[PDB]
Amino acid sequence: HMERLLDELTLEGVARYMQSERCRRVICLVGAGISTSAGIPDFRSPSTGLYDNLEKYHLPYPEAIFEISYFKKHPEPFFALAKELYPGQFKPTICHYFMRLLKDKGLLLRCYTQNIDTLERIAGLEQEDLVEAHGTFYTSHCVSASCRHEYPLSWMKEKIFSEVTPKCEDCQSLVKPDIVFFGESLPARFFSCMQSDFLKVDLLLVMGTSLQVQPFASLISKAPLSTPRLLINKEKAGQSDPFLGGMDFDSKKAYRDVAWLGECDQGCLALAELLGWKKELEDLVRREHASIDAQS
Ligand SMILES: [Zn+2]
């Protein structure tokens, strides 16, 4: 398969491709693994125990706490759990700032994220750069269709910590964080952007996602057949399930998929180093972290 775009199936090969004229547009697909080093737990991991200690709320079924209709009937369990799990700090990771550098260098077509933690926005990705496939806590909206007053995270955090159920100042309906609940569709933006972006992509950077939740995981099968796909993740992921266009890292037919196994921050640091960006990345992270630490 000598017509392949990567000269070798390694991080070095990906970096050479990125700095070549053939690689102009990068799509990042990111999940919980890019935020665990910021102290944000993987909410979909059973080890997080998201559905443990819910007996106190007397739910009809455990998932009711994340179901839109139940939430509109009984929002208190959700907000109590949100207080319990609310992060102590919102400091984006090296990986988030690596994506900001991609944006700065003119390479970022889009970041599709499964995360709700807002760290992409704090790191400087703008609305146009992002597809928050599972929604976000970055904004909240009044639930009444005729009103839809928007509230920022600071307002919602004050309500969560004072243990006052958030109500709209205009109409007194419940205000809900913009995360996708059970019984809700993924945002239209997810499908709209997918249909356009994957015609234009030169590289998929898949970071911190095990590609286990649909339809987000299917994004990898939307890339053109020639598009290299780099996985930076603690574990290999995205390969075909031996039971049930997956990643092929290791067969003799492999031609475009590369796995770098380790912490996402370390993989992004290694890639930045190959690209000559390590000092830029360090300076950016150190300045942004200093700024966050110095909020007065
Ligand atoms: Zn309202």
| Residue 157: CATH number of its domain | 3.30.1600.10
Answer yes or no: do 81 and 168 share one domain: yes
What element of type H or E holds 11? helix 11-19
Strand partners, 194: none
All residues at 6 or more sequence positions from 63 whose CB lies less than 8 Å from its CB, including other chains:
51, 182
What is residue 222's three-state secondary structure? helix
Give me the active site residues, please: 134
User: Are residue 262 and residue 227 in the same domain, yes or no?
Assistant: yes
Same structural domain, 30 and 63: no
Q: Which element (helix H / strand E) includes 16? A: helix 11-19
The domain boundary, picked from 169, 187, 205, lies at 187
Pair type for strands 135-142 and 150-152? antiparallel
CA distance 114 to 93: 16
Domain identity same for 20 and 101: yes
As a whole number of angstroms, the distance between CA 292 and CA 2 comes to 48
Q: Where are the alpha helices (DSSP H) in the chain?
A: 11-19, 68-73, 76-85, 94-104, 119-122, 153-162, 188-197, 264-275, 278-293
| Residue type at position 93 | T
Q: Which domain holds residue 107?
A: 1-36+93-133+188-296
Q: Which residues pair with 203 in a beta bridge?
A: 26
**Which of 168, 187, 206 corresponds to the end of one domain?**
187
Verify that 66 and 178 share a domain, yes or no: yes
Q: What residues are designated binding site?
A: 32-36, 42-44, 114-117, 142, 147, 168, 171, 209-210, 233-235, 264
Residue 167 CA to ligand 1 centre (angstroms): 8
> What's the gap in Å between 140 CA and the centre of ligand 1?
11
Give the DSSP H/E element, type plus range, for residue 261.
Answer: strand 257-261
Resolution in A: 1.2
The method of structure determination was X-ray
Alpha-carbon distances of 185 from 134, 138, 189, rounded to whole Å: 9, 18, 11
**Residue stretches of the annotated binding site for NAD(+):** 32-36, 42-44, 114-117, 209-210, 233-235, 264
Q: Are residues 88 and 100 in the same domain?
A: no
Q: Helix (H, G, I), strand (E, B), or coil: what is residue 121?
A: helix
Binding-site members for Zn(2+) are: 142, 147, 168, 171
Ligand 1 center–CA 143 separation, angstroms = 7
Question: What is the distance between the alpha carbons of residues 251 and 288, in angstroms, rounded to a whole number?
Answer: 41
Whether 228 and 246 map to the same domain: the answer is yes
**Number of domains making up the chain:** 2
Co-location of 147 and 79 in the same domain: yes
For residue 292, how far is its CA from the centre of ligand 1 (angstroms)? 32
Is the domain of 161 the same as that of 84?
A: yes
Beta-bridge partner residues of 206:
29, 231
Coil, strand or helix at 52: coil
Residues 30 and 84 in one domain: no
Locate the DSSP E strands across 54-168.
108-113, 130-132, 135-142, 150-152
CA neighbours closer than 13 Å in the CB half-sphere of residue 77: 24
Q: Residue 154 C-alpha to ligand 1 middle, in angstroms?
A: 17
User: What is the amino acid identity at position 1?
Assistant: H
Q: Residue 81 has which token pair?
A: 């759990």
Half-sphere exposure of 114 (CA within 13 A, CB side): 26
The closest of 92, 110, 86 to 28, measured between CA atoms, is 110
Whole-angstrom distance, CA of residue 4 vs CA of residue 256: 7
Same domain, 119 and 263: yes
Co-location of 53 and 158 in the same domain = yes
